[PDB]
Design a protein around this nucleic acid. Sequence first.
DNA 1: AGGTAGTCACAGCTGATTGCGCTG
Lengths: 179, 434, 38, 126, 258
Amino acid sequence: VLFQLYKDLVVSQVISAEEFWANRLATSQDIINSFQSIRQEMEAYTPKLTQVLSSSAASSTITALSPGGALMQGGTQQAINQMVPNDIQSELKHLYVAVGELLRHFWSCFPVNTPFLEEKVVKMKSNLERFQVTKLCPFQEKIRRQYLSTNLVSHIEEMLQTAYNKLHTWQSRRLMKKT
Amino acid sequence: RNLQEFLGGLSPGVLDRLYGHPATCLAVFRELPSLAKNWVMRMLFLEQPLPQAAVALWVKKEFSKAQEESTGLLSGLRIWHTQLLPGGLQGLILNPIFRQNLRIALLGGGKAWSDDTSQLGPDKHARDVPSLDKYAEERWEVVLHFMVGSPSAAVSQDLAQLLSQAGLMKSTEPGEPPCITSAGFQFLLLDTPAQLWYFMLQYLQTAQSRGMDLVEILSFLFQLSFSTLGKDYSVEGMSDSLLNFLQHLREFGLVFQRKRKSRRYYPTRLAINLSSGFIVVETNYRLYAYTESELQIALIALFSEMLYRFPNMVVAQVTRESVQQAIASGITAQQIIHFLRTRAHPVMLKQTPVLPPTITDQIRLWELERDRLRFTEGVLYNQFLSQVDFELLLAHARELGVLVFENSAKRLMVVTPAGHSDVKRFWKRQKHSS
Amino acid sequence: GTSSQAEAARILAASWPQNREDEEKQKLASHLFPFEKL
Amino acid sequence: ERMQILQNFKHNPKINTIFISKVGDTSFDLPEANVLIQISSHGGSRRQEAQRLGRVLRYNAFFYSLVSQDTQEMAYSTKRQRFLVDQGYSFKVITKLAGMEEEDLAFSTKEEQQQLLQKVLAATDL
Amino acid sequence: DELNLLVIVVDANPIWWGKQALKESQFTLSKCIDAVMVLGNSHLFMNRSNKLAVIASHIQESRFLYDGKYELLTSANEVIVEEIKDLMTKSDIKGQHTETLLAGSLAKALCYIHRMNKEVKDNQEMKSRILVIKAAEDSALQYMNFMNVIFAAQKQNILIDACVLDSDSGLLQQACDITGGLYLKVPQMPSLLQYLLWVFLPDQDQRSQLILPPPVHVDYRAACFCHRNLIEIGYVCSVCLSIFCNFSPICTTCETAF
DNA sequence: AGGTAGTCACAGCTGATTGCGCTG
Ligand SMILES: [Zn+2]
Ligand SMILES: [Zn+2]
């Protein structure tokens, strides 16, 4: 796995060999008006029998509560244990491991307290972008070709977007501190 | 027999007529199993039938047995009926009469179960709840004493005939009082609500001899079951047969009524408990009863030896001889254990086993002593020259169902005396045809 | 012997208090001893 | 020998069961024990049964009494427990032992059982 | 001997129901009260031994609410209607407090269950559950009391079921998850009675047999001591375990211990 | 036809005999 990870990051020009082992080692009085109105409305209140439920409402509720309904959804990842074959699942696991390691390096670099780390974080972001372009885009193309219904790439996209937003916010703070 | 067993044996017309009264529907619904009640409540507001598969998918796979039992019981009680859904499907929908009356009982609608109580104003001779309970106890004790035959308790002739029809007491010779049978002892050993229910079921079965409507009697009984204790109800609005049934209930102690012409009647705790602790048991085979009436003392003495009789306490010892005598009288050990557990003192209820296991096990073992030897009269055949001849005769005996015991190793068989002639004729004919 | 084991087990295991208790079972933890709970 | 047997009965995991013949029917220095299995005690000695029970108490523990059905030992056991039931003890009746046929026990077949009659009748102390 | 106790907590916040009436929607407080009464009547119908309690949660305080129809049901419904009328008609807005006192209602429900359990005879076990219908928004100021109530309910093995109408409540989700209850959000308000009868009517033993909706995504966001707001990441003390949104050189709670 | 002193089993104790061990 480590050798496979090394090839996918160094041979594919995602990261340099030097950097690879370096890391390894409410409203106005209208509310009172509404309260008065509801108090007056409920002052003359009587129990009801027909209006409590209707045949249409009960049928709709049973349809919702029947299997395959909104609340009782029956699909819910039917055969993901066998969907998207394990050959792709192994590749997805490898991508998850690579993303986890790169983000671990990024979050270990954070917070940036010295000017040396500033270049290191930029290099880490460049490595993340190169890894994304190298692996995720062909992975997304393969998924679209196979038309997989699962949004496997979505979590990786969310993690990358969170890291990029954090870095952009930190850069914006750094620029404002120098103003 | 419980209520559901009797209801399931009635014709569909009687069941349909019963559901026309809201009180009957509530009793039937409460008699249902736990799973059936949820299905009834879910389908209470449905105007369309549901697929059978959809209903079957509500319960998990492991509990499918309970689902099948509940569905079968509902079908037998005719609460819902099969509907031919278009497209070859089968739909289940509640009975419209039963559903309407159940909703009326729950939500509301129509007129009250009783006519009124304020028309005649307050009762001039109203009693209290403890007084009503004492009256019910006195009536039930009088009935059970009349079962024994003491001259102090004198009841109506028809009440005695009802016991005669129930088989508890048989009048072999006219003029002399009937003698209680073993079934009478077993009935006495039963608890009071079960005794009342058995008596009412016998009354329902034999009502056809008196020409009384079963549906009306059942509806009135169910209405009495849900009646509020200590509250009077209107006699008016009932048929003449219902008046006679109410008088019989008053004789039974279920209903209190000052006069036959009175327009008020007070349901008692027996009537409320009709639809549905003073004995201390010790590990040293001793019984302590906090009772004073002769009835409980006699019932406990039926299967135990009395030692002391305090004004408010009875000290008794359960011995082997007393239990054996009670079993010889016809009372089984299970009935004794049930009676002890039902009458158990509230203190004994604290232990997870209400009755200590040693006493119950000892009583059960004492019951098994009597039936150690099993007796079956019969005729023994041991003159079989060949195994093949024995096999044919044994097969013929098993076909006739007159076999008692078989021994293939020693070619020995035992047959009932009634089938002995048939077996002899079959054996003789085989030799003649040879 | 093969049959001797079966005959002895049948005689011993079900002599007096089994020809009736088993019939009742067919027709129908705190106080249980440790060997009866295993 | 008795002293050394009783001494090695307690502080030894290899051996943890001993047999006593009317010797422990008094107050001795027997170590703490949990299980007592009495077979063929005296006739109706409530004192002996109470003493034997006292060697166990010190469900932490449990003591068994083995009797033979349809024999005088039944009446002896019945009449020798009336002291303990007065003390408050309840004697549960055990008719079947769970897993009796699960494992192998002695006298499995009828041959050795009927051979045991020869040796048990061989006393002939006349 | 199976005694089931069903304490129903009704969110009777006047402001939310007033806004609902202003919206002129098909669902009002009257229909909700009718559905609650019908559910209680069904619960009493299921068995003789079943016991019912209805508690109305209001801004001022918590109010114990409890002709062809059943006699006991008639009296129960009349008492419920009288109590809800007395609560709503005499409910005068005096103060800026708007959040519903849900925690106090649950505490009163737990106290009532504790009282009922002792009065239950020793031969019977009283299984108790609490059903809550949520109308107004969740209250963050009551986080600690709500958590204490959840823990007390879990200690006594009391189910807490939430029936959210409009806005989800994280506290109710946590209560349902911890106590083993069911959390359900009603999509169509007029179907409230049918939802209650289909889902919350069966007991926990009956819930085992029946197939029920899976638990919803329960959140576990904590409440900051100095802000009382939902937070994702916060500073937690090591001595008193108090949670803070920002770092402080001296813990405020540890000041108590000298 | 009924009841109390021998008697057997199993244990205890104390009172003598009587039989094996007793130095780097
Ligand atoms: Zn803070
Ligand atoms: Zn602190």
